Copies of this chain bind each other. A is one copy, B any other.
Amino acid sequence: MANMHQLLTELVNRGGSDLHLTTNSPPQIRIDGKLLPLDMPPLNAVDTKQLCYSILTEQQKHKFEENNELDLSFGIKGLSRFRGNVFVQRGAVAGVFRVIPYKILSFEELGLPPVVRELAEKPRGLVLVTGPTGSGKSTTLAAIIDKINTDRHEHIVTVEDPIEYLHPHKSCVVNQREVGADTKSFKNALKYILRQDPDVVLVGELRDLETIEAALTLAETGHLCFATLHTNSAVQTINRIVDVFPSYQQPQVRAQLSFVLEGVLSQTLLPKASGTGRVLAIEVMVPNPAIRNLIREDKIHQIYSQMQVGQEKFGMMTMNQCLYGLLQKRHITMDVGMGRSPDPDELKQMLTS
Contacts and interface: CB of A to CB of B under 8 A. Distances in A.
Interface of A: 17-18, 20, 22, 24-25, 28, 30, 34-36, 67-69, 71, 83, 85, 87-91, 94, 96, 98, 124, 131-135, 153-155, 163, 168-169, 171-173, 175-178, 181-184, 188, 191-192, 194-197, 217, 220-223, 230-231, 236, 239-240, 243-244, 246-249, 251-252, 255, 259, 296, 339-340, 342
Contacts of A240: 252, 255, 259
A313 B66 CA distance: 52
Nearest to A35: B153
Given A34-B154, A243-B251, A259-B339, 18 more contacts: A30-B197, A35-B155, A35-B172, A35-B173, A67-B184, A68-B183, A69-B188, A87-B175, A87-B192, A94-B175, A96-B196, A131-B222, A135-B221, A220-B230, A221-B230, A222-B230, A240-B252, A240-B255
A87 to B, nearest CB: 6
B173 A91 contact: no
A236 B213 CA distance: 14
A134 to B, nearest CB: 7
Contact of A133 (B22, B194, B230): B194
A248 B247 contact: yes
A89 B176 contact: yes
Given A34-B153, A175-B22, A182 B87 contact: yes
Given A89-B175, A175-B89, A134 B30 contact: no
B25 A173 contact: yes
Query: What number of copies of this chain does the assembly contain?
Result: 5
A287 B240 CA distance: 18
Centre residue among A35, A163, A217 by max chain B CB count within 10 A: A35
A301 B89 CA distance: 41
Contact of A243 (B28, B91, B178, B252): B252
